[PDB]
Design a protein around this ligand. Structure first.
Ligand SMILES: NS(=O)(=O)c1cc2c(cc1Cl)N[C@H]([C@H]1C[C@H]3C=C[C@@H]1C3)NS2(=O)=O
Lengths: 184, 33, 54, 54, 42
């Protein structure tokens, strides 16, 4: 209600897009122990960077395709590794989030066409789903690859991005409903 | 249970949600005409 | 076999497999083990129960 | 190249250093002994193709 | 909570929210169905 929900909608859109991009890039997802350092590390999404051992603060990229005695021949495992490496589902969530924010901003321009906002809501919901999928594939890949491990602040930022995206979808749909109600 | 063991049903759930939204959009466009 | 045939050896106790051609040149004893030609490979990794395991 | 090998341990190493691209045909006794010994990175498939006795 | 690892509980919450939002949307975005007798409790 109160007609100001567009503000919260776009603020949430920009905030969640920022959180998602920050999480995709900062390389702080997994606090664990690796033989590369073995020692402590703060691996992320694209590149691993140790914090312990002879070389501290040294960052190197991770292969995602080690010699597993033809284990990469398995169709399911190969597909999972490919998706994890490309990491296209979180990217897709960010893209959909950005497009939804763009549609919401345009709504202030083309107020005649309501379908813009419905598209925005659908985009945000789909972004939430894609973020879920990215999280699932990331975790399943890590498991597939009994030590101690823990998740970094960037992962919780991704979770916040998902929650925000779904809330925004709700608000956009409510906006569209009210507008149609008052537009007969 | 790790998440690797029970991921398939999550994939199925997400596919179902996508399918539902697609179907609803299809019905929406159809009843628009 | 050369050691026994060419006099360099008097007896032999070992994982030595019988066969016709080898038996046509030297006397033999009775079997003291059972065996057979068998395959050997590297343990394939434990395939996790794939998707649709429910 | 020639799949053959000079000695048993050479075949063991080859199968354990081939990413599962090499299969070695040896007896049923040495095979089991190896299976029981660490790191136990190998296994026996199928049944004996023929029994011979030592 | 030991029988199900922490990750599964997190993703359960995520999917509960996703499903609830999707159901709300689907049931109540098409004005055609609920325009009359304004029509659904979802
Ligand atoms: N350890 S085992 O089961 O493989 C095994 C196998 C065999 C053994 C003894 C043992 Cl312990 N001796 C017999 C021999 C003994 C006498 C009986 C047969 C031969 C002559 N041959 S065998 O059948 O090849």
């Amino acid at each position: 209600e109160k007609g100001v929900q567009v503000l919260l909608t776009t603020i949430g859109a920009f905030a969640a897009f920022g959180l998602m991009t920050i999480a995709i890039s900062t390389d702080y997802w997994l606090y664990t122990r690796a033989l590369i350092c073995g020692g402590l590390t703060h691996s992320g999404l694209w590149r691993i960077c140790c914090l312990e051992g002879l070389k501290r603060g040294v960052c190197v990229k991770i292969n995602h395709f080690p010699e597993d005695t033809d284990y990469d021949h398995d169709s399911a495992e190969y597909l999972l590794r490919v998706v994890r490496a490309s990491s296209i589902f979180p990217i897709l969530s960010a893209i959909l989030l950005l497009l939804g924010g763009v549609c919401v901003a345009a709504s202030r321009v083309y107020k005649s066409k309501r379908n813009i906002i419905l598209g925005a809501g659908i985009l945000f919901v789909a972004a939430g789903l894609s973020n879920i999928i990215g999280v699932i594939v990331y975790i399943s890949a890590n498991a597939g690859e009994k030590n101690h491990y823990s998740y970094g602040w960037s992962f919780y930022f991704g979770g916040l991005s998902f929650i925000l995206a779904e809330v925004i979808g709700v608000l956009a749909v409510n906006i569209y409903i009210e507008r149609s109600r008052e537009a007969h | 249970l790790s998440l690797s063991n029970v991921a398939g049903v999550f994939y199925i759930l997400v596919g179902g949600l996508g399918l539902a939204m697609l179907v609803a959009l299809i019905e929406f466009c159809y009843k628009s005409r | 076999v050369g050691e026994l045939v060419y006099g360099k050896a008097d007896i032999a106790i070992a994982p030595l497999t019988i066969t016709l051609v080898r038996e046509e040149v030297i006397d033999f004893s009775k079997p003291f083990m059972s065996l057979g030609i068998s395959i050997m490979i590297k343990k394939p990794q434990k395939s996790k129960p794939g998707v649709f395991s429910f | 190249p020639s799949v053959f090998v000079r000695t048993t341990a050479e075949g063991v190493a080859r199968v354990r250093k081939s990413k599962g691209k090499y299969a070695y045909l040896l007896e049923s006794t040495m095979n089991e002994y190896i299976e029981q010994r660490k790191p136990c990175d190998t296994m026996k498939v199928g049944g004996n193709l023929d029994s011979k006795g030592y | 909570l030991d029988p199900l690892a922490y990750e599964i509980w997190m993703c359960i919450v995520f999917a509960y929210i996703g499903v609830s939002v999707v159901l709300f949307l689907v049931s109540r975005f098409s004005p055609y169905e609920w325009h009359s007798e304004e029509s659904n409790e979802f």
